[PDB]
Amino acid sequence: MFDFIIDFETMGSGEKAAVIDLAVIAFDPNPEVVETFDELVSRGIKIKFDLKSQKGHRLFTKSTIEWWKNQSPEARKNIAPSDEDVSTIDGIAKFNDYINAHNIDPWKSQGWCRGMSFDFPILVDLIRDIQRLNGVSENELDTFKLEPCKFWNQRDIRTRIEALLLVRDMTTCPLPKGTLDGFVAHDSIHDCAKDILMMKYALRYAMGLEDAPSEEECDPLSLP
Amino acid sequence: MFDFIIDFETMGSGEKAAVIDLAVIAFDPNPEVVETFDELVSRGIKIKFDLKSQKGHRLFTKSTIEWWKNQSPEARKNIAPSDEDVSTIDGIAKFNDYINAHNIDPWKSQGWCRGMSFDFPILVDLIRDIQRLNGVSENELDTFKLEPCKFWNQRDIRTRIEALLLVRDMTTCPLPKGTLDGFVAHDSIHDCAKDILMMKYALRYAMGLEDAPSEEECDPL
Secondary structure (H helix, E strand, C coil): CEEEEEEEEECCCCCCECEEEEEEEEECCCCCCCCCHHHHHHHCEEEEECCHHHCCCCECCHHHHHHHHCCCCCHHHCCCCCCCCECHHHHHHHHHHHHHHCCECCCCCCEECCCCCCHHHHHHHHHHHHHHHCCCCCCCCCCHHHCCCCHHHECCHHHHHHHHHCCCCCCCCCCCCCCCCCCCCCCHHHHHHHHHHHHHHHHHHHHCCCCCCCCCCCCCCCCC | CEEEEEEEEECCCCCCECEEEEEEEEECCCCCCCCCHHHHHHHCEEEEECHHHHECCEECCHHHHHHHHCCCCCHHHHHCCCCCEECHHHHHHHHHHHHHCCCECCCCCCEEECCHHHHHHHHHHHHHHHHHHCCCCHHHCCCCCCCCCCHHHEEEHHHHHHHHHCCCCCCCCCCECCCCCCCCCCCHHHHHHHHHHHHHHHHHHHHCCCCCCCCECCCCC
16 A cells, blocks of 8 residues: 655646646655655656646636746746646546556545645646536535545645654755755656655654764755 | 634535634644643634525535534534624634734744645635735735735644654544543534644653553543
8 A cells, every 4th residue: 555645836826726737656655665766756757737728727826927937947847838738637537547556545545745735625626627527516526536535634744744853844854865866956756756755754763763864964955 | 922723614625615614723832831621712713604695605515515414413503594693704804803813923823724625725715805805806816915824834733643643544642631621522612622732742742741641531532
């Protein structure tokens, strides 16, 4: 059994946010197992959505567009159109392909996320669109049996690392030096692999397994 | 300088959920400050909304309506019309009054709930209806300076307790006996006080300021 992590990049803020892409990775929650950054990145996939066709169906927030215009061209690499794009319907199918293929348990597995009240509300709204497409009215939607985890198995990464590390507003975990090696800046799959590694070390630290690094000894990409 | 906690009871499960009542308690996050159940309960408020007035504005989901049909007539007594009912605008003003009078810092305080992806999305939407009332359009809604806490200072209770106790899927914490004396089942404010109590003790337990019993208030369970 695996847990998974999701990340959206969005052009809006509500649950009806227009979505740029989606990254998901299925990691092994065992505190003894420590998977490396390389095969965490290799194991995950990024789903890229076509912006132009979400017009009139999902929402683009002026607040968020202003934000993206103040982002380096490396960051704005994500949003630029592509031949790899998919419809939100096609994107959610690729997402369920990934979930079923990576030993995710409908009842026991947990879905991690940094911003739990941001990501999953978009995930669920994309899922109910398969049913809206089916003609199901908005009061008769029911996705209980269609979600990658049970709503009480959703989990928030900031809460977890703060609790694991017992420092108020401590939402990133220092790592050992050079595990950051290979990291590239504005990659969604690199974000998820950092956050999984930070959670594992946090968990390994809190139990008595490993030594928290010295500021000389920790990868600079980890401290924020 | 406090934190706070919120709890919604709803007739639906998206951010347009019709809202039955809202419960908020401000609370001291210092682990050396252990506050009594009776003390928290009287510090909270419950805002109760008019369901009829939300019809055609908020969402009444059939599965949630069925679920309230299977609940006891004591729990179901929550959803009956009252003379203490407020429109959803009125309620959010009452929400903002309480946050403004209880030592909440807009930048450093933390906001808590069970199912962070259920309670906060509803609350922010009710905030956005302040902006929708001011004539703002959807692509221009922006509630950053209105929200009781910055979105990154939000916190999930199930993640907290489970990560304080270091036990998978353990999201309630055992309490020393007599703590929850006065607890009542279908009560929003009591649920919030219990959650504030189980998080503070879990932190006490995780910090080793106090040893967790095997002989608890029978209510933690």
